[model samples]
Target chain A: SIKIRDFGLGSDLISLTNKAGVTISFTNLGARIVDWQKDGKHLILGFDSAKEYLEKDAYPGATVGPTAGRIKDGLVKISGKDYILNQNEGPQTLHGGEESIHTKLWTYEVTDLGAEVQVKFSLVSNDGTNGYPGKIEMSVTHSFDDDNKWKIHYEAISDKDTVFNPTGHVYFNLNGDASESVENHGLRLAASRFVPLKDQTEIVRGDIVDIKNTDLDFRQEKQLSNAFNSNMEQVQLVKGIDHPFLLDQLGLDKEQARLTLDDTSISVFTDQPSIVIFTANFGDLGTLYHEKKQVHHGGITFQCQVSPGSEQIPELGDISLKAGEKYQATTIYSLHTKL
Target chain B: SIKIRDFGLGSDLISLTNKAGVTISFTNLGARIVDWQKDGKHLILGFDSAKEYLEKDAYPGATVGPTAGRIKDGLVKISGKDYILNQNEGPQTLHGGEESIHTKLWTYEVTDLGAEVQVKFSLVSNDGTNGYPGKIEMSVTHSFDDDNKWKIHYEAISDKDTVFNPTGHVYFNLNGDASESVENHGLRLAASRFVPLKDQTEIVRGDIVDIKNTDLDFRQEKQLSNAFNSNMEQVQLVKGIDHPFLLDQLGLDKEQARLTLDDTSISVFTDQPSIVIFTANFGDLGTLYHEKKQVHHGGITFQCQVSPGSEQIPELGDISLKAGEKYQATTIYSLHTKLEHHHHHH
Candidate 1:
């Protein structure tokens, strides 16, 4: 049995075993949201979870780019040369195509305080990862806060041919089941607008619609009353969201509020330059099983991100990564009110 | 262009476009959360400014999967032979295992009420789409309630030695922007026990965890505060929920009160017999443009789905889809309230 407890700042992640299950994990150094578990079930949260979900695959801690999202066609004209990228995602070039940094492993060292973990990840693209150029170095920090918030900070430095569109993904589930449903959880996105995706893959750039009229809107904050509220043409595109967004209007430095959410009454806050939020809709294939019964569940997640993707829409932001230079992004997760 | 409107059921799901980049979309058909552009960018519920905010490739009617999450190892035995599934997402097979019903074009028809339209889609799996076996067939439906609750239902029937699982997916940004994030908006789900998956993609039965204990638990419903809380492991698998839940617990005869949400104080109901909830938490790649600006947005979604994915886990339900047999699942998207304490919203 695993029992997990969240201790505020100055504390290391705690592990507990109770009637709930075996829950372990804590992020201390940079405000990272660890995880909880019972038996062997893992709870989801933070972009770190997104990373682990990908396992040690590639680009361990490095960000994907050249166009983090999609590049209409797999064609890019860099320095007058029409560079062709990888078609990993449908017909478009995703995450810097083959040159994405999301395909590497990172070296990590447990913090002395035992509250945080620091990792180093690097990748060098031979001028073609998503039709981009140059080499890049990346670093990631998994820290915890006293407020029970998990902070994931990412920094990368790109060299001459490289671009710099970077972002991280993390999942959430108010409950402890990593395989649970998050339908009833309340939601609140601070961005008044959203980046509509491509029609085919739902990963391309579309309209910068506002969260006002359509079921896509959530700027004012509301409980996810219903997952699907409409059946519009745009609504039918990818069926769900598996895309990107740009964050130029939401004042970057001073920290303009970006989003807030609550399941029953729990709270979460974010004011990153941009963010990518996703709800785990594993469908019927992926369910958590306990005892002799198979349990079905859902999860909600938030990714404190950067400008638009580098691959799909690199012009929106500079996604050039260098060899030695360093880049940094801070993400914080906390709970407000009470469940 | 595209002036989508949310006409609550009875007369819901129509577009009213004009110009201003303020198109009114029925955010919640059940809650009446319409684009009410009053002062600059305020909330009024209905009748808002219209505009051209959508220019990307995003579609408003593309359905999602037969399986939304990833299937690790991709080795499932059907009739004895071991089949290797695809591994599109990292080392795991994802979203209908590379190919699914959503990949096909749907045959659509408009109801007598111009507001409502119906789409019929079906698929018959061959040797391997993403590994699982058997020739399966599926059908789906999407409807909006009187207010704005959009309901999605699915039915799958299969024959021969095989497995079945299909779902519906719709990405929405009530705010409609790529720069925004959806971490807050009250939420509630009707589930106590969940089937936790193992590394092999095998679900371990017997565990009813609460929502607070970890970042993955949404049982009690919470907000999307900050970037990451403390649960990192939960976030690892599937980025933001690449899993599913059994709907049987909620019961069939009576549409189990599953999820309830309160966006900006508006109440919405989700009566999903079984729903697959996922948080799109990969990277902000799309850089989706909306309302004349490069928007960064994030929101949630609901999917009415099924697995017919039984037999494998034995403990799970029976998901044997018989050939020529019609499988029907009735899911309603109606609106109700928890007027009193005893009233359960979902």
Candidate 2:
């Protein structure tokens, strides 16, 4: 037996073990990672009970799409037609509308692809869900390699002309205790130009600008807390960092970003055009465990997605994928920790 | 709290009580009737374990079909376009193919229309289910009137041109021991004609003939065992009665048939065009109260439905409903009993 058991309401906890001292507990409730242990130490932020993943709206540990990031006023233009979507974040639609990919149950199939353990999660959404036209089938596979990298590969095909943008929203903290502030941890981004939002609403405006002198710049490795107290205009509106960085694509793998703490570190690499980095911007909604009180800045979420408002930018690849065209993207988190 | 509980694997045992000493236990698994008790002498054949209803293939106490009965060679023609369906019965398609409406889980809503308790079960089938084209939405409502009649109303709408024929296949043996023979029960049919199937294959081979002279006739009330040993060609093929009677449509209600056993009697009244009377012809496939051998002629199934093979019969109404058209039918089983009922501990 592979050791499968019922967890949460009607989902399953699929356990995959490696004799090299790595064990993973996953839940199909959101096809999410429950825990990723190497020699038995928690490497990611997660609730003790999987139901908390269902009871919360933070999109923790699950794929946060159909379309991740915020859509301005829940409006999108496709082939001269505009569609209105479910607006949960003020007037803008955030993270695939109301019943986002993270909140829905996903069917999973596990297999060993080559040398790594992989589980593919799949679901089909009906037409007009969150006001999106045409039915969409999406699949994401989480494959763990012996090299210590957790790779997420996403692919989707729609029957009608529609947009597809999904990203794995896993909150990571190498220090184990996620409740502690990550102000001392260092960060680096492989992006030079980033999308700037309009004030506090987090809606990216039209033009893509340079990250030159603004505190929004993370072109070089520096403390992540530096942006937490930056004097940038958009940084002041949102209290901390919650922005999408345009990828530079300067290297072989398009090295996205890296996070470090103590002697432990994890590097993110993706083929996507951009990555949306957040400092748990809204403070984890007082749900993150912090002794007896609600806390903020608990964990850092690295969401490798397209530029938040790529649909609005005509020059950027057409967000509306034609019926037969395929949508595919990949992101990897290779862990390098001192045991 | 409204009080809801889970029963049998993934089904629900929804109970609705009436002040007149009547209570019903319904299950969403196949949307079948677990029990319909007035005082509780086991009025109909049912198992204490609801999963038994799911495990069996006879489709007892549940709504059977997106299309009921047999279709010759599993072929259907829609606006001149032909489609081949799943063949499970010998070489023909029988009772909505393999996984018919009776086998699938149905979503139900309960309410009381005035004083009568009613539950409507609904389900959606995708296109190409059992090789049937188009998505079909079917809804069946089981309503119990205070007047002691159980009325079943069926409604179906398809998004593509498809067949719609569903019937409630609840076998009744008024004596309560369904495994025992129902041969002595009095039976009557409101039809003067019957379709003759080709040998044991059960495929209608054209022409409808008069039932007046042959053993197929049930014009006047007669014992159900009368046709058991008849020398008629169709009778020898099926062993017992398993034929669809063409509705006479003499009156508004079209009261189809009646079965009387000792002090208990039940009548079938429907809006459908015909009734398929099955005398458990092939037997109950062993699974009865006893843990021993297979049983035969266990119960009587009075399936009121539209004429089977109506797609090939030009005179009868078309079974192929258009995309936007609605298919509706209703049947009522009014019970008549003389003896006092006793409540049994469950």
Candidate 3:
């Protein structure tokens, strides 16, 4: 079942419920996932009103890009011509510019499939908007099933040469209370390589180094507190894991990552090239998360997208789209509970 | 005669002398017009050394831009793409950014045209530099003739679609004493319209209003003090005249503006669409001008370029350059002396 209601500032909130008593609510403003609950246990960081999201939320559970990560020096070269994109993070373009997709109003539609329900949010970015070339029509669809699987599907089409790499910035606490620290949460990733960032700008340093023997190594399940408390230079750079890990697989046949906290856990499956893990490393977000408590590493994200800085490194694969090309990618988070 | 010498900080100063006994000195640092003199009187404000220029100068006689003047919010759209430029002055981009051409070292060449000696300074701004598209190769040439005329030639070519509007930020105080106020200087402009600025940001407010019956009406020769002391809203907004005046003509056939003092005057002739008059309106400069007195409206500039904010206002004409287009413009300042005009002023 799905219901729609007004969320302040002329925006609408859509709530989708499955037969298993699971519910997820989203706002058309940035297609943000504001609330996700199972048996009254909230799973993500969110706000009570649209005004808080507009004024204080730092991409909590919002759709992030046209290009989701930091682009060095905000420079992009398409077809031999250089483009200097809008820089929001010092010299780098982070999560696009200040006026990126995360801040725009999106048009949404709902579809009911007998076994599952889905809500699609769409947006059109005109040519040369945000310093990227082409008129792009993009959409992000959220679908949930009675089996406790939440799937995110992204699609885009451009009329000219451009780049498209979108991702959801969803932070999960699993403990239901978003303010509860994720220090005890167990995490594992099927990633053997991670992109290192520069010490000052925190942008990708153009090299995908091996994670063996490093704090970034998460091949084996371990408490997230290990990585959080490590004094490694990389960990100390951004205070925690704010780097992208290269996923070893592209098919959904295998679980690429997992997060477990006591009785509940989630398995992440995606066809994207990498997953950027950001442990909410901020200090004291003035606004309360879930209207409960101050947020600081209280939750973590599994942002799946193409490796950032791919424009400068050809080995990471092309993220650009030519005229008449379609972009499609998907990720799924399957929930589970132990007796 | 031309003399070249080191001017500190890895830069050199090139001084050229005309047959009329006038001398002008420039430094490759921003290709600045550092010193201009006739006999022993200095005609423009300047600092003593290259180090002083790098640390204290606010574009004093330096070459400004790939795009000069104030760009509102630093937003520029080219080839259907919007580029948010590096903002230096509040929200608006003034004289480009912190790393504009004026802050870059330029390569120069000297040519001896028998009738006039010329020094050309050139620079190459890469694509996406300062949020502007296309790789631009541009040059500014200064030619001083025996007739006491200083001709400024600007030319450029860009490899892609972009905007190019470069100008010289040369402040002139005909009295030759740099810190002396231009309050008594007689000024005349062959302009019928002027672009007004917003009260807050000081950016062009879009409409090019008529100067008729306004303090900006410099159609007839009047003391610059008249415009400076007027209590009009426009004059009060900037504290003085810092607006662009639309020239009545573009060719070198007529003088577009003029500035006169006791015994000397400069007739401005340009091929550009407008002349931006900026009276150094500010408090005291921490450093001395011409290494002498403190500056504050001590001099005034006649910046020649396409009217700023043309990207939004179509009537001002297109300042955008297509892939294969070439840009060319020239401004000449012809100096004169009158014995009778000197006595009438006092």
Candidate 4:
């Protein structure tokens, strides 16, 4: 069942309830997920009102990109010309500059299936917006199934060749409370390599290295607290797991990652080639979550998308969408509970 | 007399010869000081052709503005409207963005003043250029007198209120050789304070601190080599002297700084409140200079302009020009040579 109502400020609140009694609420602003609950237990970190999201947005449960991550020097070359992007991070473009999709209102529609419900949110980014070439029409469809599976499908097409790598920056706290940190949560990834960042700067070093023996090697199911306490240089650089891990396989045939806490776990399946893991390595957010709890490193996000720094490292493959071409990718998070 | 000739790929070379045998050449592109010579000896670091400058520009001897230094987040608020300027340095606007005054071709006119010769270059910056508000009419005048003094006069006016702090970014090699480091050059500044930068970032810390007992202290004349070898944090941050020093006084009456090497010395006089001293703290330029020498810290510059970080630190004073108001400032570099000291020392 799907329900719609007026959200805070000037946005529509959308709710989708699955057969298993799992409910998810979304807002038209940023096409963001405001709440994800199973039997009244919130599974994500978000605010109660859209006004707080507007004033104190930290990309919680929001769509990120036209191209996510940092683009060094804000220089993008499409065809033969160089286009300068609006830089928000010291000459580098972060999360698609200042006026990113995470702050825009999106148009959405509901699609009803026999045992599934989906809401597709669409946005049009004009050419030369944020110094990027090409006008792009993009859509993000989020669906809930009777099997307790939440899936994300992204599609984009541009009028000109331009970089496009959109991802969901949804921070999850399977513990059902956002006030608590995810230190007790267990994490596992099917990634063999990860990108390293330059010292002190959030920019990638333009190379991928093996994760063997490194703290980033999360192939085996390990507690999140262990990685946070490790004395790895990369860990020390960002204060936590804020690096992108290269997935071993493409398509949603197998689980790419899994997160578990207490009695619940989520097996992530994605067609994307990489996943950026961020442990919310930040200070106080100065705002309260829907549970009326202060926010710190209260959640962890699995940003399933294309590899970052592809512009400088050509071997990483192109993330651009051609004028006549369509780009599509999918990711699924299946919820599980122990008896 | 002033001579105008073809320069480089698409620029006009304008030269003014003073009675003291000092010839200063400027180009219409960026209103740059291309060559400064006294008796055929090049005294500044620049390229042999304008084409080299266009290809490998490090701000050499060009006019820098609309606002120089680094504006945090490329943000400026004028008349209650927030304007986002084009950022060139990792979110900070440096040298006024990618297409700054340093990269524009200007129009020029020559004015003869009996014992002095001057060439004035003017440029019009349309509104919304480089994301800045207002249309600005700006001019930079280069004048040379029989007393071996080279003077710079900057003037600007905007149709709308906007930030404006224009300065001359001229690198001087007093030894007349661009290949040599400025380590041997003696320096002195009338500044007692300097702005500090954040760690690993070029952004100012929003406060001006005293330079007492610091490597930035140049109140007393000292050799530039000592500063390069200092273990000061600020010196290590930029690899050398690249901080803006607060001037003790403004106006052309007093010398703000002095650079001396061998027999030649130039005393800098400006009406600006601050001066940024850069010892060319960079690597090889890949391009050869006018003296056919590789460039490194081969020169030193005395960038005379308003204090940097004025936007964040309001007490530093305003660098903005209100609508209908005029902006004007002058800087002079008086050159001198010791008698019978022409032979090289060290």
Best-performing candidate as measured by lDDT: 3
TM-score of each: 0.39, 0.57, 0.53, 0.51
* Of candidates 4 and 1, the better by lDDT: 4
Instruction: Specify the poorest-scoring 10-residue window by lDDT in model 1 chain A.
Output: A2-11
Query: Runs in model 2 with CA error above 4 Å?
Result: A1-3, A250-252, A290-294, B1-346
Cand. 2 TM to true fold:
0.57
Per-residue CA lDDT of model 3 for A64-103, tens digit only, reads 8889988988898887789877677898888876557776
Q: Model 3: how far is B224 from its true place, Å?
A: 1.1
Give candidate 1's total backbone clashes. Answer: 265
B1-346: candidate 3 lDDT, tens digit per residue: 8887656543567888888788888877776788888778878778877768767775989889878898889988888888787677898878876546776556577889877888888766655555676567788898888888888899888878988888988889877775677877888899999898877688888788888767778888788888988998888888888988889877777888888887788888988999999898875753576556655677899999898878667788777888879899898888887722744352
Per-residue lDDT tens digits for candidate 4, residues B176-251, read 7767888787788898999888765688788889987776677887778778888888888888878788987776
Q: Write the per-residue lDDT of candidate 2 for residues A39-80, one digit (tens) a residue.
A: 566677776555567565447788877788888888988778
- When summed lDDT is taken over every stretch of 10 residues in candidate 4 chain B, the lowest stretch is B337-346
Please give the ranking of all candidate structures by TM-score, highest first, separated by commas: 2, 3, 4, 1
Reference-based lDDT, residue B12, model 2: 57
Per-residue alpha-carbon lDDT of candidate 1 for residues A1-339, written as tens digits (9 for 90 to 100): 222222221112323232233333532212233454324534454223332323322321234453555555666555446666556667676555542344322222344333333322222332222334443445555554334444456666555444555555445555545444555555655555566665555554634555566676655555554434456555455444443333434433333332333322333343445666555444454432221111232555455555454445544445444555566666555434334
- Against the hidden true structure, what lDDT does model 1 obtain? 0.42
The DockQ of predicted model 2 stands at: 0.06
lDDT of 1 by residue, B1-346 (tens): 2333222111123332223333333322111223423123322212221111112222123344445444554455555566555555566555554423333222222233334333333333432334444345555555443343444556666545555554444443333343454454334545443445554353332342344455544555555432233345544544455345555354444543323223222232333344555555535554333332322225444555443233245554544344556666544433334422322221
Better of 2 and 4 by TM-score: 2
Best by DockQ: 2
